[PDB]
DNA sequence: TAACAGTGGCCTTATTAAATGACTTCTCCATGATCTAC
């Protein structure tokens, strides 16, 4: 049918942020489309259409709920409160790059405790070189992020806004 | 008017090439929830 997002790497309104946007977007949408092959499996049945530079989603029902369901299976946190992207082989990545990545996420994006709550300082010992070293890092149980999908739709009608967002 | 215009041997031997301590101090935050006044 018509998709109700469409992105594309020609548009001419696009800066490279957007740009590199639309690409985490696509690592996104393969890795989710590899972890659920079917599209009654995912959330308000959103389905994409993926090719070189370009991005398509469809989804049926309410948009609030395809892009809640989208949103929050992109950005997780796992057991620990580190930041799990699912764009990212997290099984292929060991723990310490994890966490590597995600202090820089929270240091660099998630600058402002406004857009994150806080858990406990996590302290883990793995050893190296048959010394155990104490990986000290900031758990998190929320980032904004995992619920921007309320700032893209609307209050009442609980669609996609027609206007712009700040 | 002439024939010479120095023949030698050396051209530094030692020793030490830095010892200290300092390697910026402050401040200017951004953003949203809430208080509050109109």
């Not at 070189?52 to 409160?81: R, V």
């Given at each position: 049918?018509?998709?109700?997002?469409?992105?594309?790497?020609?548009?001419?309104?696009?800066?490279?942020?957007?740009?590199?946007?639309?690409?985490?977007?696509?690592?996104?949408?393969?890795?989710?489309?590899?972890?659920?092959?079917?599209?009654?499996?995912?959330?308000?049945?959103?389905?994409?259409?993926?090719?070189?530079?370009?991005?398509?989603?469809?989804?049926?029902?309410?948009?609030?709920?395809?892009?809640?369901?989208?949103?929050?299976?992109?950005?997780?946190?796992?057991?620990?409160?580190?930041?799990?992207?699912?764009?990212?082989?997290?099984?292929?990545?060991?723990?310490?790059?994890?966490?590597?990545?995600?202090?820089?996420?929270?240091?660099?994006?998630?600058?402002?405790?406004?857009?994150?709550?806080?858990?406990?300082?996590?302290?883990?010992?793995?050893?190296?070189?048959?010394?155990?070293?104490?990986?000290?890092?900031?758990?998190?149980?929320?980032?904004?992020?995992?619920?921007?999908?309320?700032?893209?739709?609307?209050?009442?009608?609980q669609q996609l806004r027609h206007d712009y967002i700040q």
């Amino acid at each position: 049918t018509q998709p109700k997002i469409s992105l594309s790497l020609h548009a001419a309104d696009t800066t490279i942020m957007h740009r590199v946007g639309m690409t985490g977007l696509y690592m996104t949408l393969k890795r989710l489309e590899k972890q659920y092959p079917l599209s009654r499996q995912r959330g308000g049945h959103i389905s994409w259409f993926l090719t070189a530079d370009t991005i398509e989603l469809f989804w049926e029902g309410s948009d609030f709920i395809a892009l809640s369901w989208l949103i929050n299976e992109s950005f997780q946190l796992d057991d620990t409160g580190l930041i799990h992207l699912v764009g990212l082989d997290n099984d292929r990545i060991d723990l310490r790059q994890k966490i590597h990545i995600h202090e820089g996420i929270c240091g660099v994006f998630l600058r402002l405790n406004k857009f994150y709550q806080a858990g406990e300082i996590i302290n883990t010992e793995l050893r190296f070189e048959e010394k155990q070293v104490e990986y000290q890092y900031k758990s998190l149980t929320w980032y904004a992020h995992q619920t921007f999908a309320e700032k893209l739709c609307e209050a009442d009608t609980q669609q996609l806004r027609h206007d712009y967002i700040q």
